[PDB]
Amino acid sequence: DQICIGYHANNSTEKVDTILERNVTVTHAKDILEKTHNGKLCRLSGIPPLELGDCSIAGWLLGNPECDRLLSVPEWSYIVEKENPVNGLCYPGSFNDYEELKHLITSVTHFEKVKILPRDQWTQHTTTGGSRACAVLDNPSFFRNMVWLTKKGSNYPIAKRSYNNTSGEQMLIIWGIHHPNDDAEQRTLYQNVGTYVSVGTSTLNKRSIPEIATRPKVNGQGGRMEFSWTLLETWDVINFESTGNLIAPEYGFKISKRGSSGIMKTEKTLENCETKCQTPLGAINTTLPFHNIHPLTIGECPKYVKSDRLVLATGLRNVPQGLFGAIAGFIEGGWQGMVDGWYGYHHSNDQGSGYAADKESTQKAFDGITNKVNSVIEKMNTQFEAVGKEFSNLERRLENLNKKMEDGFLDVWTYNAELLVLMENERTLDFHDSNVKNLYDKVRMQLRDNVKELGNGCFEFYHKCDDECMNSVKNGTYDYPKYEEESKAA
Amino acid sequence: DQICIGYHANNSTEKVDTILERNVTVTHAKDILEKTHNGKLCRLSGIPPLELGDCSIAGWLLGNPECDRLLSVPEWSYIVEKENPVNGLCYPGSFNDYEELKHLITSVTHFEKVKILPRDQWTQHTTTGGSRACAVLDNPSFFRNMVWLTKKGSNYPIAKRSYNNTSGEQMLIIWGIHHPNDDAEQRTLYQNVGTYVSVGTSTLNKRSIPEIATRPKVNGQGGRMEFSWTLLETWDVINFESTGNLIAPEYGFKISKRGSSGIMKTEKTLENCETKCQTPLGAINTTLPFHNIHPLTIGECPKYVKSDRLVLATGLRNVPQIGLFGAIAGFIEGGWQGMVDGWYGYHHSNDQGSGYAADKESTQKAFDGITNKVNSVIEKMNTQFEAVGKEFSNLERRLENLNKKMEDGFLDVWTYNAELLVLMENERTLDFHDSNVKNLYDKVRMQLRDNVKELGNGCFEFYHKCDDECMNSVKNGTYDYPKYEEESKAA
Amino acid sequence: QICIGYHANNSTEKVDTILERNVTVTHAKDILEKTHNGKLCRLSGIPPLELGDCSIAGWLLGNPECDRLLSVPEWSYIVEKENPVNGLCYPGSFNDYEELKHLITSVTHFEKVKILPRDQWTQHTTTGGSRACAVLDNPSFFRNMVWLTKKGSNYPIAKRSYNNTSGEQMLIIWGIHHPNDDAEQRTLYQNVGTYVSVGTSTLNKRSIPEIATRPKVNGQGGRMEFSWTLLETWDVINFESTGNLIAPEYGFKISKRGSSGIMKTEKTLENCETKCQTPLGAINTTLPFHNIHPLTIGECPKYVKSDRLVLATGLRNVPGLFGAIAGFIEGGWQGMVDGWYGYHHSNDQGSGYAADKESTQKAFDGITNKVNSVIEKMNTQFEAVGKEFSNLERRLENLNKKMEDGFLDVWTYNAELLVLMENERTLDFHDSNVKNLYDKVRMQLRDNVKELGNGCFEFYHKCDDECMNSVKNGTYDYPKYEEESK
Structure with missing residues (x-):
């Protein structure tokens, strides 16, 4: 027992x-x-995230032709790019505070493209300018959302237009300045040398001046285009004023944010x-x-x-x-x-x-x-x-x-x-x-x-x-x- | 037992x-x-902390009239501000490297105001220029530590004054440039169109051109004033020169640091x-x-x-x-x-x-x-x-x-x-x-x-x-x- | 028991x-x-790169005081004295300097090369120097750089370029001169409203000289502002100027595994x-x-x-x-x-x-x-x-x-x-x-x-x-x- x-x-x-x-x-x-x-x-x-696949945020926002058809949800929780997008600045150049911009649209409410400065209303300038760098099938073209102002006949009068943000939301607006290869090119496109691009809102005061240098070709172009951006408050106005070299937006993007997120680099x-x-x-x-x-x-x-x-x-x-x-x-x-x-x-x-x-x-x-x-x-x-x-x-x-x-x-x-x-x-x-x-x-x-x-x-x-x-x-x-x-x- | x-x-x-x-x-x-x-x-x-109440650091240092009757201790360990200070740049504009300036004066020794450039000694310039964007009671007014140099009669001769820092300490000095809304404004204020502001020390070297361009009115102004700042070293000289648009300082601030701190946003x-x-x-x-x-x-x-x-x-x-x-x-x-x-x-x-x-x-x-x-x-x-x-x-x-x-x-x-x-x-x-x-x-x-x-x-x-x-x-x-x-x- | x-x-x-x-x-x-x-x-x-009391700018620009420095072709970190004595002997500044230092803390390898022989500036004077860089004690200058000035009384457009065929990314530095006054501008460069422009397939830059009275530093009221780029293999750098250009004669071939840091010590x-x-x-x-x-x-x-x-x-x-x-x-x-x-x-x-x-x-x-x-x-x-x-x-x-x-x-x-x-x-x-x-x-x-x-x-x-x-x-x-x- x-x-x-x-x-x-x-x-x-x-x-x-x-x-x-x-x-x-x-x-x-x-x-x-x-x-x-x-x-x-x-x-x-x-x-859902915003899916960019082959395109960069710059290529998409500017309307690089290989990007301007992108689907685009009105609201997204993050962004999916590839490690190194093929399609960005078709016309070569740079984007000021580009990372800050990317961080800003990383997560949104709400995002909506709006026509703010109809291109036909630049009545005193030529507006049809384009580049072989942005060619399609295969005529010269250009960033679809942007307008390349050049002289009309022999004249580039001052270019002054403004837009009031009556949209109801803050508005992301992008603009650029063109830096030619030489003074002759500068005179051909803008007639005058010694020009400026000026953008002002209630909070933003920015002036750029053309910086001409001799450059190796990129996408077959020796010239460069330098872009900037701002957030236009509701009921605020943005004033463009330029004597030459302005690359004007035709569109702006209504935007509401819920906080921030990130870009995820993947092939999925x-x-x-x-x-x-x-x-x-x-x-x-x-x-x-x-x-x-x-x-x-x-x-x-x-x-x-x-x-x-x-x-x-x-x-x-x-x-x-x-x-x-x-x-x-x-x-x-x-x-x-x-x-x-x-x-x-x-x-x-x-x-x-x-x-x-x-x-x-x-x-x-x-x-x-x-x-x-x-x-x-x-x-x-x-x-x-x-x-x-x-x-x-x-x-x-x-x-x-x-x-x-x-x-x-x-x-x-x-x-x-x-x-x-x-x-x-x-x-x-x-x-x-x-x-x-x-x-x-x-x-x-x-x-x-x-x-x-x-x-x-x-x-x-x-x-x-x-x-x-x-x-x-x-x-x-x-x-x-x-x-x-x-x-x-x- | x-x-x-x-x-x-x-x-x-x-x-x-x-x-x-x-x-x-x-x-x-x-x-x-x-x-x-x-x-x-x-x-x-x-x-103690420096208390700023409704004034931002910019407003206080520039002397926005709403801030010009403010305490200011000889020494502080942090800065207290309200969440969103009401009074800052009364005349609209900006402030370069403002966050760095703010971080710099977050905690000081020692912080002493000095009249380095008495305004009355701009003898070839009108100096009493004010604006409704800084109205006092309720006349036109301006940042009390700064001087809006404007034409005298029909003339704005070149403005050149300089200062040697013999204060025995690093000195904070701020200056501005005025970007008018239009040519008529440039012309009224400075007579000459095509001007420049130039500032120079041993280490600082800066030359700017006013940007005349139409803008939305802020506090009733299309123009903007853009301010910058430097620390003037002991025994060094700062040179100001302008054919127009200079917003000159009348004062500098002797500053001594014993480490850094931060700003606390509260109503207390x-x-x-x-x-x-x-x-x-x-x-x-x-x-x-x-x-x-x-x-x-x-x-x-x-x-x-x-x-x-x-x-x-x-x-x-x-x-x-139990x-x-x-x-x-x-x-x-x-x-x-x-x-x-x-x-x-x-x-x-x-x-x-x-x-x-x-x-x-x-x-x-x-x-x-x-x-x-x-x-x-x-x-x-x-x-x-x-x-x-x-x-x-x-x-x-x-x-x-x-x-x-x-x-x-x-x-x-x-x-x-x-x-x-x-x-x-x-x-x-x-x-x-x-x-x-x-x-x-x-x-x-x-x-x-x-x-x-x-x-x-x-x-x-x-x-x-x-x-x-x-x-x-x-x-x-x-x-x-x-x-x-x-x-x-x-x- | x-x-x-x-x-x-x-x-x-x-x-x-x-x-x-x-x-x-x-x-x-x-x-x-x-x-x-x-x-x-x-x-x-x-081994570390040992700079003594020379700063990195002083070293790369070729401050005369830094000649007996003798670098290595490869290094795992950099040793600098707490407070270098030899940097910009001619007073000025260096754009994105800290980013440069961080970039070269650890290399494999490093090699100076004569990308723009100064002999070939045949339409300009290249012998310019300053008592601010005095050697013994005559005017001198940064030894890797070239101060171009008017020849006789003419400063023709200065136009040279270089193709990086060296097989390695190349660090290249240049400067612009901001004179103390107009007399100085004309004495040196004849022309008055000049520019310095630099271009590669990614870099675009045009600088205008700022003429303004400043306190003497090392006896100079003038200043030199330096900038740098990393030239890619097979890319081209183009310099154009009508005055005030401080040109490189040399570039530096550089390859990096990863990044390191700078150690300050006397040892x-x-x-x-x-x-x-x-x-x-x-x-x-x-x-x-x-x-x-x-x-x-x-x-x-x-x-x-x-x-x-x-x-x-x-x-x-x-x-x-x-x-x-x-x-x-x-x-x-x-x-x-x-x-x-x-x-x-x-x-x-x-x-x-x-x-x-x-x-x-x-x-x-x-x-x-x-x-x-x-x-x-x-x-x-x-x-x-x-x-x-x-x-x-x-x-x-x-x-x-x-x-x-x-x-x-x-x-x-x-x-x-x-x-x-x-x-x-x-x-x-x-x-x-x-x-x-x-x-x-x-x-x-x-x-x-x-x-x-x-x-x-x-x-x-x-x-x-x-x-x-x-x-x-x-x-x-x-x-x-x-x-x-x-």
Whole structure:
């Protein structure tokens, strides 16, 4: 007649690491590192991104002919370009504060193209000018949203037009100045040398002057076009005033913003799809606190880490057949044959044997570990972020500062997440150990001298312990006085 | 005759969370999150802030008439402004590298006004030019620290004046150029069309041409004034020259810096108050490592976190009566209301009485231990002076965003780590108490050996008479086993 | 009889734990690196560029004072004196200077070339110089640059170009001269309303000279404004000017792996090797933290605001959660040298100490994993902490400071607390190891022995060396000696 304290073992091969040990096999585990995505570009919190594919934001906004037909949703949650768009400034040049502009339209309400300065109303200038650099099929053309003002006959009178933003929303307006190859070209196109482009609003005062230099051809053009932009407040007016070289907008873009986002550089396309965390490889749908998919995410995302593996122990050390000496200790092996709990008893008497899980201690352990896992996951704070940024090539220092920052956080999170898992895994194994030792002690303190401590977690009865008796032990209501007399001999 | 091991219980309903459990009731606890402030704007380490009220820094430095009766201390540790200052560039315009200027004077020594270019000495120019965009009461007026040079009679001769910085300190100097709305304006003000403004020091070299162009009226003006600034070094000279459109300074500002600070946007005004950590809602007075009061602080501050609650268990699990080591709420089913003199102790019964006594040794151990734990979590926090809030122009959104992403970054790190630290430390504090009771019980057991019987929940029944002196020797670990058998009673 | 016990020694090593301060332990491991070699070293095989008291502009422009500089063709970082003495001897400025410096902190390789031989400026005077760049002490000039001035009394259009056929991107610098007055303009350039224009396939620029009275610097009221571009392979740069152009005669072939930084120090290269350099000396450590100096370059440990980070490895030195060590087993044993935990026995045959190498070995393996967990998990990517910002970039500089201070705070705190937490666990781990040992014997002997309460067991039967051995290894035969008669 004997009763034994034991613990669960199974066919698990799942390993974890702890602070003190490596590759420990445990009965149950849970990975808290998200490693999978759906390989798709999705809508973010219900809003699609703006898809530019081959074109750059400049090529699109200016209306580079290979871009001016782009579809264009009225509202988007982020922007998807390719790494290096083929179609941008068809006519070569530069764009002032181009990155700031990109950052501005990265997420919008609301965005709508509007005709603000009908091109036919430049009655004193020629308006049909174009370039072979922007040729189609294959006549010379030009940015579709813009107007190249040149002299009419031999005259370029001052060009003065204004527009009042009665639209109802702030309006993005873009304009440019042309820098010819030489003075002769300057005289041919604008008749006068020594000209200026002047743009003014309530908040903006900008003047550019043509800068003529000898340049290698780009897209077959030695000339350059330099563009600028502003936000025109509602009910405000913008005044264009130029004696030559102005590249005027014919259109403006109504814009409302909801906050900011980012550009995501990928070769993928939108699908009928919903996510809260987008990566260039696909979308993440996860509750886990960490992922290792891609650094450049957009949305409310888990923390990116370097690790390939973050597995928490939930079950106990799997010993098919610690701090507290019981598990894989004086109770040297686990019972492959206890399926109904983590800890329990095996009993032998005239009636049989023997496996019975302790429901309470098991229930307490499940609660405990459930809280552990939930602690590590739920306490992670998450807010919307767009990780990737645009910097120009005279902003390497700024780019580098942003890189050091993202690297510093990567280091902090990777280090802490690894050690957290190592520490908690250690303590989890010991938690189970403790639970078993306490179960073993409940039985001991009940039996005392009415049984012998057989070692290996077994108790040898000095009396006849029937099934009902065994149950009284298993439920902590064993009747010691009843089995005095019939004890050893006494 | 018996002696029982036990542990403190009390009235507390104070709750903590651990890694394994939520809302555990403990006898004592300490909040390590600072949640309160004094609702005052205060001096920062002895030094007051500069108060600007409704004026922006530009308005104040240029001397917008609405700002020209303003305090201005000899020295400040930060700048207080209202969220959107009413008074700035009264005549419409702009200010080059304005954010840098603002950052520069965020905290000064020492800040002294000097009349470097007395206006009355522009003898070949009209100097009393004013505008309705700066109307005083309610006559035309102008920035009181600046001089609008305009034609005298029908003439605007070349204007050349210079100044040597013999102030013995770096000097902040501001100047402007006027961009008229039209040629008639250029002509009225400066006679000549085709003018220039030129400014030169040892390190600064700048020449600008006025931009005449039609613009929407702001404060009734199509024109704009564009201001720039430089620091004139000790003993260096600044040369002004203009055939028109120069907005000259009459004053410069001797400036000495002892580090940088920031600007705090609030409606509060300075009070006779001292703090090391200021927020827009009021000052924080604390040694605690974390706070949740406001993100935009100035001073030496606790780490800001996104939690409502960070409570460390100090006492033990409160189990008043009518764990890893299995004693507390375990084989010793409950605690003792009646033991006030310690955390763990004994109850003894014998012929002479009974019998609560705190075990002094293990109680002291526990007090020292928990005291060190709390002190570890609090003292190890490195805290240096910072001004969270920053100024970025409307064309520095990427930069502003970089700043936001950084603060959010440390916010997430500190919040996650603080929440987890507490959960983990509370877990171990409960187990420490549990262990302490378990060890105390074992201490008695190992002394008594078979001179006593283990009775259940923490109690020993002696097989021999144990009077108060015997109890004492047990309580202080000098029990005398060989003396007490009489363990013929054991059989 | 037989007693369980643990190692003690003559250590005075002190560690702190979350619960306790100044605990003496048998052994401990410092994880904070505090020493450097006091030398300036090569970085993974490659030396720094050493500029003495010449600034980078002074060097690239060819300030006469910088002639005996002698560069290298490849370098891993740049060493500059805290405050260079030789920069723009002719007063002026340098557009996007800091971006230039950042671009050349680390190259492979670098080579000056004569892209625009000055002999070929046949329609201009090229001998112009200034007492501001005086050599010995006659007027001189930046040696890589060419001050063009009127020839006789004519300054024909200056028109030259260059095609980068050198096979490498080429750094090219030019300047414009802003004279002090009109007399100076005419003396130098004849013409008055002149320009300098520069063009490549990406660069477009036309500058007008600013003539204005300024304070004398190095005796000059005039100023030279320099700008730079990176010319692509097979691209062309075109200079055109009617005056005021300060032209390059040379360009610099440049290839970059990645970026580094500039170290300010007085020290000079000393023929050592390192993978982590501070301005005080190089660091050679496997440890995860260091407190030598903030501004490092290379693959460095995390820098922290800490004087001491000592990890306990051994046990409390006694010449805990489990109550064994410094508990019911009052003291350690000097005499037990082979292990952390063990036995002492008293016999008819003798005594005494025997290390239990199983539990010791399991412990050594455990602590070793802990230590190397703390160390190896640390990331160490190459980096250059120090950064250059101009005097109108204070906000950006302060933003960078805020970031460094941020990580420092995080790392200092986590490192301090990590050490305190792990140390309390280490001590309790040893305590538990002793307790389980004592219980291993107790649960074996059972009825056949007396538990004294000081770690000792007193046999109710004779226990010879062999019996003792079965106890010391968990094969003790309880039935064999069961003859009670206690």
